[PDB]
């Protein structure tokens, strides 16, 4: 017997509805809550203000153990590159200066790059992460001394050995095939890519 | 030398 203190008992089985619509009067309880951490009101008596209810308990007889099949609905606007997912973040060890006067050798560092959030294709991403490597180069690497041939992290998608002739030992079209095979990376001496705190290693 | 590539 699903005893509700106002109406007659509704014996047997029923349905409780927890809907995302705490927008009428239960919105002084969900001020700091989102559509995923909210406080509904499962009491739908259409004679009490949504707040005058929500102080009335649904009571099923206590001589029995009550089960209930939960069946849920859920939408999402979640994109690709958002930060919550930990996408849009990667670290790269990238040259900051050719011939550091202290050592006469290049000086590499560990910069954390950040792509603009939003839902991108699989290419526009790998071009947005190339537009961050070649966008920190403009501020740390331009005015410290490094040729564009020193950019040492380039997310490429070719199979660079297409044309490679074993006899001659080098590709013999005079160019790379520019046909996408896989997102692979292309590094240089010292430079690297760290995906520990990141999640682009999946995308 | 036969560089099979057409060129």
């Amino acid at each position: 017997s699903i005893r509700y203190s106002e109406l007659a008992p509704l014996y047997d089985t029923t349905r409780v509805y927890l809907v995302d619509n705490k927008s009428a009067d239960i919105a002084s309880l969900n001020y700091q809550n989102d559509h995923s951490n909210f406080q509904t009101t499962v009491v739908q008596n259409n004679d009490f203000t949504p707040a005058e209810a929500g102080t009335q308990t649904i009571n099923f007889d206590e001589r029995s153990r009550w089960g209930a099949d939960l069946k849920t609905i859920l939408r999402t606007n979640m994109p690709n590159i958002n930060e919550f997912m930990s996408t849009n973040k990667f670290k790269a060890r990238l040259m900051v200066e050719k011939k550091n006067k202290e050592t006469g050798l290049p000086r590499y560092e560990w910069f954390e790059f950040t792509l603009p959030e939003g839902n991108y294709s699989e290419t526009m991403t790998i071009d947005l992460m190339n537009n961050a490597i070649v966008d920190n180069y403009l501020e740390v690497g331009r005015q410290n001394g490094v040729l564009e041939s020193d950019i040492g992290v380039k997310f490429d998608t070719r199979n660079f050995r297409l044309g490679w002739d074993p006899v001659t030992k080098l590709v013999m079209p005079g160019v790379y095939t520019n046909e996408a095979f896989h997102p692979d990376i292309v590094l240089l001496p010292g430079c690297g890519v760290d995906f520990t705190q990141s999640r682009l290693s999946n995308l | 030398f036969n560089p099979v590539y057409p060129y």
Binding site: S5, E6, T55, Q56, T57, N59 | -
Partner: protein, 46 residues
């Protein structure tokens, strides 16, 4: 209810009273069971 005009929204605060007991029980050492009531609005005879 009828009150005179002030210029700052006020809010009447009626207190419809009513019994409001709670009867904690404590059976097996370790459990407390509570069973409230409020009788002009009703709640958990739980």
């Amino acid at each position: 209810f009828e009150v005179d005009p002030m210029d700052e929204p006020t809010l009447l605060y009626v207190l419809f009273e009513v019994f409001d007991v709670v009867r904690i029980h404590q059976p097996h050492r370790g459990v407390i069971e509570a069973v409230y009531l409020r009788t002009p609005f009703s709640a958990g005879n739980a």
